[PDB]
Write a protein that binds this ligand. Structure first.
Ligand SMILES: [C-]#N
Length: 153
């Protein structure tokens, strides 16, 4: 799905998330939780967070934000050759956590907003282009393993 010009544009932008990995996932997650309250109920450790301040105050959210981007960060450094790190997440999020594919759509959009907000001006038409594609290739590979186990379709 993507070339190196494009991969190279994805990793430069990732370069940005890594200087503040915990600030970028707290915000990503906040943005998911307030945008789609429904997703917050899946978590028995953050279901208690009614407000956005109880959320931003939360030291447990930021520790969960890190895991999220550390695990995502690693798939993308693979440049679509993620068959290995991905199998386990698809199979965890599907049989165990039972998260439908569109919640993965919510997070992706969520990531792309967050990148705008925090870098208001240094994430362009092309980077934005290439970051969408990779998050798309990502969802698609999972959809493919989500279809094998027959989790909703
Ligand atoms: C996982 N979030």
């Amino acid at each position: 799905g993507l070339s190196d010009g494009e991969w190279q544009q994805v990793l430069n932008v990732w370069g940005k998330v890594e200087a503040d990995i915990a600030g970028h996932g707290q915000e990503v997650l906040i943005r998911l939780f307030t945008g789609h309250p429904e997703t917050l109920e899946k978590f028995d450790k953050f279901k208690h967070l009614k407000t956005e301040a109880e959320m931003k105050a939360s030291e447990d959210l930021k520790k969960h934000g890190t895991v999220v981007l550390t695990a995502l960060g690693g798939i993308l450094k693979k440049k679509g050759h993620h068959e290995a790190e991905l199998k386990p997440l698809a199979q965890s999020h599907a049989t165990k956590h039972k998260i439908p594919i569109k919640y993965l759509e919510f997070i992706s959009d969520a990531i792309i907003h967050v990148l705008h907000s925090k870098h208001p001006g240094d994430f362009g038409a092309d980077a934005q282009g290439a970051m969408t594609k990779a998050l798309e290739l990502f969802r698609n590979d999972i959809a493919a393993k989500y279809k094998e186990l027959g989790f909703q379709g």
